[PDB]
């Protein structure tokens, strides 16, 4: 428990990288988060909007 | 300049698909221009078929 300042720095940088990776699963309003899935479902001009 | 049937006129656009757009005349996705059409039944039809 005494080393909490150093463990906190290790924890914060791990949590920031895990959050950055988990944001690849988000849609942001698109039909899918998987990029090849969009390109399989849709025509060229519609896929570009997604 | 070319002649086609009325149902096919709406195939002449950027990003479209259909037999004339597919196999006869393709516009690019970045097209800058205008597509003009007029019915020509009196000029281009013939009795027994043109």
Handedness of CA A40, A45, B1, B4 (dihedral sign): positive
Give the distance from residue A45's alpha carbon to the nearest chain B alpha carbon, in angstroms.
Answer: 6
For A13, A47, B11, the CA distances from B15, given in Å and listed in that order, are 45, 11, 9
Instruction: Name, in order, each residue with C-beta under 8 angstroms of B28's C-beta and a sequence gap of 6 or more.
Output: B14
Structure tokens at A24: 């690849």
Contact A44 B17 (CB under 8 A): no
Structure tokens at B7: 């149902």
CB < 8 Å to A49, chain B: none
């Amino acid at each position: 428990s005494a080393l909490g300042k150093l463990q906190d720095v290790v924890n914060q940088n791990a949590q920031a990288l895990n959050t950055l990776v988990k944001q690849l699963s988000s849609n942001f309003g698109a039909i899918s988060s998987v990029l090849n899935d969009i390109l399989s479902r849709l025509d060229k001009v519609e896929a570009e909007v997604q | 300049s070319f002649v086609i049937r009325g149902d096919e006129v709406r195939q002449i656009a950027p990003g479209q698909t259909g037999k004339i757009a597919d196999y006869n005349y393709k516009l690019p996705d970045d097209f800058t221009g205008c597509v003009i059409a007029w019915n020509s039944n009196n000029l281009d039809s013939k009795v027994g078929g043109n």
